[PDB]
A = this chain, B = another copy of it.
């Protein structure tokens, strides 16, 4: 059999001894020549269909040799192209001859889904009647044929006859619908058996036809076969069995079998019975009829396995991140920008942590990356776990080098030399390469080299020069495939890419949303939870200056919560003040006002709306911008907010796409918004919550949502500390984490209790929401954190004194978490 070799960071199929060279292969017997060719072509087909690899064959001569014309032509028929160099590149060292096979197609959604087939085949076993001949459909022909079948005569005058006269000349030739066959007196009943699988599938697949057996092909004379050599009943049974044996694949309903008419009609000589003439009419078949199973091959597990008929048709006609595939270029330019002329180590925080923890790791890595002048070295605690493989103790870090003039190299740094270290690194490199092709959709020639390094004080395969990353184009394409691959797993870089995906979605929605600035002066923005409301407010405050040419101090931002106005104030895009400061102080020099979380405002101090109206309308440059952002799902009190009636809140814009939270968080927000709708507070006008999220919208970004209940306060603290330490080990910064409690009066208690547990995890710094720039965990109330967001949020015992306010707390908590949310309710 053919089996993939395990000691390689790639699919390596050893096809054994093969005779190479045209002259050497001409001296072979045809049987051995065809057997060796079929072995090598099985290997090539498997590697083409399985992400590419290397075919290893031991050659019977020491000196360099050509592959052989028959092998070359078989590869050409395999790829349906004379461009062999595109998919096959050969090397030879001593007795070993290598063919390096590129993947036929890459990714779950290739750019050629509707053009080229997913599979290469030695044969599709699909035959069509092509005029007077039967020809096999190649991969592309069969792809088009199945793509069509998947959409939702005088010969009959002869066929109707009950009998035929010996030597009768048929009045028609062989054509698209007719075939004549004559067989010897001896083998008639056996030659019919081999005739059926070739002409019945062809007629069935190409509009049907008539098969006359017993008609001289040249003179068209009816001859039949002598009565003594044929039993009509046995012949009919055999033909029926052979026809019904044919493997048919259905794309339709009903799935009735192959339909045909068979007649064994007497041939009379002078009126006496001379023999029997066999006539088959093959009515067109609804779908594809195969003469036998397709000769397509694939590597599954560690074997080279032949694809079944149904599995082949499925591959030929029919966690991946579609958003990642869409934004791969932007995401690559963001996270994996390839610099012009130096080797970049990323993530930089993780690299610093590694070199600090491990003595000599910096010197090791820098001495090892001497040969590389341009590229990126993507570090990780363990690329194995990043790719859903098993963690190996003793592995300090894994670094994926993507440098110029070099192949990708997966480095594994071991604190102590280990026997299984090279096996672990090879497994990780093989998984990475297979993912870069099959999931990342890399259509170029890729090989990830596994290379183990030891901090304490089988040869690699030499790939062609076309597997080296020549320059910017190849490095960027490989890195964009790596982006797509990473967005399919849970890891530090995957989460960073997900954050950038959320930022890109928010930018898209803001591009759609900012076109209202030219159209409105007053505008009440009704954003749903996680809809980007505050990001839109910031970007609109930037665009207001960009358009009206007014200096930043002329734009005012008003919010209810001090943490939010501090966060907005540190952006330097405007002046940011709280509701109370807004009412107290003078702002006659302000032209534009943006008011955010207006549903959280209060009337107890004054008419904030009236003040904003006066300031904006009395502006010198016409009526200034007065945009009031608000979310009624995130109300924080039962009193009237001073907003105008709902009927008065016009013109309106609605941010209904959730773009700030990962999919698990967004689904939870959508679920809880139904609970909010079920019983709105009395200060919430009933018709406001009738805003619904976009029905078919999804973020396509992985998140986390763990709800742990019936746990005590100390258990909550220890779980939070353990999760924080696990994140920080992987490389998440402390400024990605926030702990949100029910109310402020509990903030100090929970701060002390959480420090008590975090002193075991080596970070003893917590802060209120008023400081968001420091690299520290933020502990505060859910309400005080309104408007702000963090990647990882721990929601601790959501609570309020009045059930009329309670429902909104869970939304106001979940909407703060971008990717990871941990909720610890009462129980």
**In contact, B175 and A66 (Cβ under 8 angstroms):** yes
Which B residue sits closest to A646, measured CB to CB?
Answer: B622
Q: Which of A74-132 contact B (CB under 8 A)?
A: 76, 81-85, 90, 115, 128, 130-132
Which B residue sits closest to A645, measured CB to CB?
Answer: B622
Which residues of B are found within 8 Å of A522, using beta-carbon distances?
Answer: 650-651
Query: Does A600 sit within 8 A of B, measured CB to CB?
Result: no
Contact of A650 among B130, B135, B141, B623 (CB under 8 A): B623
CA distance A131 to B71 in the complex (A): 11
Which residues of B are found within 8 Å of A141, using beta-carbon distances?
Answer: 81-83
Query: Does A172 sit within 8 A of B, measured CB to CB?
Result: yes
User: With A65-B173, A171-B64 given, is the CB distance from A82 to B653 under 8 Å?
Assistant: no
Query: Does A549 sit within 8 A of B, measured CB to CB?
Result: no
Contact of A520 among B83, B131, B135, B651 (CB under 8 A): B651
Query: Does A67 sit within 8 A of B, measured CB to CB?
Result: yes
How many subunits of this chain does the assembly comprise? 2
Which residues of B are found within 8 Å of A176, using beta-carbon distances?
Answer: 84-85
CA distance A547 to B143 in the complex (A): 48
Query: Does A696 sit within 8 A of B, measured CB to CB?
Result: no
Q: Which of A193-210 contact B (CB under 8 A)?
A: 206-207
CA distance A647 to B522 in the complex (A): 12
Query: Does A519 sit within 8 A of B, measured CB to CB?
Result: yes
Query: Does A69 sit within 8 A of B, measured CB to CB?
Result: yes
**In contact, A128 and B650 (Cβ under 8 angstroms):** no
**In contact, B76 and A206 (Cβ under 8 angstroms):** no
Contact of A131 among B23, B72, B130, B647 (CB under 8 A): B72
CA distance A522 to B130 in the complex (A): 69
**In contact, A173 and B132 (Cβ under 8 angstroms):** no
**In contact, B650 and A520 (Cβ under 8 angstroms):** yes
CA distance A141 to B140 in the complex (A): 13
Query: Does A232 sit within 8 A of B, measured CB to CB?
Result: no
Which B residue sits closest to A177, measured CB to CB?
Answer: B85
**In contact, B132 and A66 (Cβ under 8 angstroms):** yes
**In contact, A64 and B172 (Cβ under 8 angstroms):** yes
**In contact, B521 and A651 (Cβ under 8 angstroms):** yes
Which residues of B are found within 8 Å of A115, using beta-carbon distances?
Answer: 115
Which residues of B are found within 8 Å of A647, using beta-carbon distances?
Answer: 622-623
**In contact, A67 and B137 (Cβ under 8 angstroms):** no
Which residues of B are found within 8 Å of A171, using beta-carbon distances?
Answer: 64
Query: Does A133 sit within 8 A of B, measured CB to CB?
Result: yes
Contact with B along A164-186 (1 / 0, CB 8 A): 00000001111110000000000
For chain A, the count of residues having a C-beta within 8 Å of the partner chain is: 50
Query: Does A21 sit within 8 A of B, measured CB to CB?
Result: yes
**In contact, B131 and A66 (Cβ under 8 angstroms):** yes
Contact with B along A714-752 (1 / 0, CB 8 A): 000000000000000000000000000000000000000
Which residues of B are found within 8 Å of A523, using beta-carbon distances?
Answer: 651
Query: Does A652 sit within 8 A of B, measured CB to CB?
Result: yes
CA distance A627 to B22 in the complex (A): 84
**In contact, A128 and B72 (Cβ under 8 angstroms):** no
Contact with B along A136-150 (1 / 0, CB 8 A): 110001000000000
**In contact, A132 and B206 (Cβ under 8 angstroms):** no
Which residues of B are found within 8 Å of A653, using beta-carbon distances?
Answer: 519
CA distance A651 to B627 in the complex (A): 12
Question: Nearest Cβ distance between residue A176 and chain B, in whole angstroms?
Answer: 6
**In contact, A83 and B651 (Cβ under 8 angstroms):** no
Query: Does A648 sit within 8 A of B, measured CB to CB?
Result: yes
Query: Does A218 sit within 8 A of B, measured CB to CB?
Result: yes
**In contact, B519 and A651 (Cβ under 8 angstroms):** yes
Which B residue sits closest to A178, measured CB to CB?
Answer: B66
User: With A72-B133, A647-B623 given, is the CB distance from A128 to B83 under 8 Å?
Assistant: yes
Which residues of B are found within 8 Å of A521, using beta-carbon distances?
Answer: 650-651
**In contact, A82 and B130 (Cβ under 8 angstroms):** yes
**In contact, A82 and B519 (Cβ under 8 angstroms):** no
Which residues of B are found within 8 Å of A90, using beta-carbon distances?
Answer: 131
CA distance A69 to B133 in the complex (A): 8
Which B residue sits closest to A518, measured CB to CB?
Answer: B652
User: With A82-B141, A519-B651, A650-B522 given, is the CB distance from A67 to B132 under 8 Å?
Assistant: yes
User: With A64-B171, A520-B651 given, is the CB distance from A135 to B85 under 8 Å?
Assistant: no
Question: Nearest Cβ distance between residue A450 and chain B, in whole angstroms?
Answer: 29
CA distance A21 to B132 in the complex (A): 11
Which B residue sits closest to A148, measured CB to CB?
Answer: B83
**In contact, A72 and B132 (Cβ under 8 angstroms):** yes
CA distance A622 to B646 in the complex (A): 9
CA distance A523 to B175 in the complex (A): 72
Question: Nearest Cβ distance between residue A227 and chain B, in whole angstroms?
Answer: 29
Question: Nearest Cβ distance between residue A675 and chain B, in whole angstroms?
Answer: 25
CA distance A115 to B137 in the complex (A): 19
CA distance A530 to B745 in the complex (A): 64
Q: Which of A1-56 contact B (CB under 8 A)?
A: 21-23
Which residues of B are found within 8 Å of A206, using beta-carbon distances?
Answer: 83, 85
Q: Which of A639-678 contact B (CB under 8 A)?
A: 647-648, 650-654
Give A residues with C-beta under 8 Å from B: 21-23, 64-67, 69, 72, 76, 81-85, 90, 115, 128, 130-133, 135-137, 141, 171-176, 206-207, 218, 518-523, 622-623, 647-648, 650-654
Q: Please list 28 pairs of residues, one from A and one from B, whose beta carbons are closer than 8 Å in the complex, sorted by A's number.
A: A22-B132, A23-B218, A64-B172, A65-B173, A66-B131, A66-B174, A69-B132, A72-B131, A72-B133, A76-B130, A76-B135, A81-B141, A82-B128, A82-B135, A82-B136, A83-B130, A83-B206, A84-B176, A85-B176, A115-B115, A519-B651, A519-B653, A519-B654, A520-B650, A521-B650, A523-B651, A622-B647, A623-B650
Which A-B residue pairs are the 7 nearest by beta carbons? A82-B135, A622-B647, A82-B130, A651-B651, A66-B173, A521-B650, A520-B651
